[PDB]
Ligand binder design. Structure first.
Ligand code: NA
Length: 141
């Protein structure tokens, strides 16, 4: 365990939007497997179904395309057709409020899901604790 275990409240019963307060983007998994953020609440690719593997581990799945959020070996977020080790994230409470998502595969490197202010996703190595890009709020769809 390389990380704390403060867990966020709530559950996985319903799909969520993952809203990044940094730039005010919803995490988006595009059909072509690219991942970014959009401020467009009506975007069909921001509806995400999270599900638990182990406690505090999640898959994050596009409801629209079925793609799993994943982070590849070079820290790039992508949409995976099938769940693999790159698709597991450690979902944690952060700053007593937000959700963060650390790549389980790369947890020892503290690679987070993050969106920059311009809506582009962060590359894993460019993320770290303390950033704004990594802070998400799950919103109802
Ligand atoms: Na894949």
């Amino acid at each position: 365990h390389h990380h704390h275990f403060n867990l966020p409240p709530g559950n996985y019963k319903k799909p969520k939007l993952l809203y990044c307060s940094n730039g005010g983007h919803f995490l988006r998994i595009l059909p072509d497997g690219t991942v970014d953020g959009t401020r467009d609440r009506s975007d069909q690719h921001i509806q995400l179904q999270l599900s638990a593997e182990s406690v505090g581990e999640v898959y994050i799945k596009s409801t629209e395309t079925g793609q799993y959020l994943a982070m590849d070996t070079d820290g790039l977020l992508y949409g995976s057709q099938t769940p693999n080790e790159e698709c597991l994230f450690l979902e944690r409470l952060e700053e007593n409020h937000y959700n963060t998502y650390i790549s389980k595969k790369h947890a020892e490197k503290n690679w987070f899901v993050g969106l920059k202010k311009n809506g582009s996703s962060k590359r894993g190595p460019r993320t770290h604790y303390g950033q704004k890009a990594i802070l998400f709020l799950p919103l109802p769809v």
